[PDB]
């Protein structure tokens, strides 16, 4: 967990830009009530579209694709999978459903990612090094939970801990890990779909970002970058739609 | 200028705790908005506290003191000076009335400051030209944070002393007035001289620690912004801890 280890941690600096994308994340985050207060009129209709588009995208990424009709029945109607691509929207249907319902109740352990993975796949016929870094990491508030999350998430793909599924498993945990920090943008805005349309970054900066990782002299700027840069697009897309402040 | 020069600026560096500081600051920035309009009572309350203890705690970090009761009647009923001790208490009044009213109608320019210096010396008998323009330059390009122009610009300001006299308390107004520019209005229900004045210690160790070799442009703004984001903090903590009460024990 190259990472998160305290060494990794305590050396990270920041340029003036990066800091100001951070304090930006922080406003956002404040106002998220706000907004709400302002607009819980469109609140509905964009949880209806996010939980469409994470389900769609965050699979497509996989290139698992089903027939647009069947994709609303699935995740809108609660339709029974008839196939394997439609066993796979089901299940990451299942396991989003209950991150955003639970997040705050499910711990980041070896338990609860088993128990998401177990969703991910009910309908198919060192994690512990891991949650135990990002833990004391937290604890001992050796970095931002902006910091914190994106890395677990850089080791979580590295570790490649399944077999199958890591990719839509860190996908899954990013928006478990930013509930826990109330950072709910991703229930109005699907994330995985804002990656997908910058699925050329995405995938350049993790690899770019996860070079000379089993070493520990890995950059971890390429992916924080694009990460804190989808999380504001995902705000930006929120505030276009609900209004601004005084 | 030496603190708001692109060199200086696109070479500043934040290690983890700082980038935590500023995500939290916005984080609280972003929220007093809802966190006013669901509890209007309780603020008129710190309010009437607030613009007292400013007064009083930047003119006492000169050194200028006035009767207990003189303080309030000065402070909240406009009363005329007597002296020269509430003259100051009266020219600070007036300043810091004129911030918490027209903050953002009060662009920071040579004008505006020497507006609010004139202001200062009402009751009394009797450079900004880059800093202002400099800091102009850094917001348009987005050099830097608010976070980080707002307390390099007043290093740079208690730095050039441009005036005979009122610098310190000048920087104070000043601080409050581009606070304002950025929706960072605690110093209105928490009043930030206050903080300083108990931790005054803090204040000047790191305002001449921060100043060393600001001449040669080689001196170093941690200590200063670590104390400055801390000062904020702790503002920010104690307006939620007094919300929290004054709105449960009615
Ligand atoms: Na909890």
Sequence with gaps: MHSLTPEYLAALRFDGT???????????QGKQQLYAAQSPEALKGLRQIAVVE???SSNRLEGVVVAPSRLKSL????????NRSEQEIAGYRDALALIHESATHMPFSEGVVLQLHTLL????????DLTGRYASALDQHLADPLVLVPLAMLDFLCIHPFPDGNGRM???????????????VGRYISLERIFEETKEGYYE??????????????????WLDYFWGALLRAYREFEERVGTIE
């Design 18 to 28: 990066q800091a100001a994308t951070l304090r930006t994340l922080g406003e956002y």
């Design 54 to 56: 994470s389900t769609e």
């Design 75 to 82: 995740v809108l109607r609660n339709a029974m999978p008839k």
């Design 121 to 128: 796949y009910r309908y198919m016929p060192a994690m512990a």
């Design 170 to 184: 860190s996908r899954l945990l990013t928006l478990l890990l930013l509930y826990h920090f109330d950072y709910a």
């Design 205 to 222: 900066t993790l690899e770019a970002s996860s070079q000379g990782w089993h070493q520990g002299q890995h950059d971890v700027k390429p």
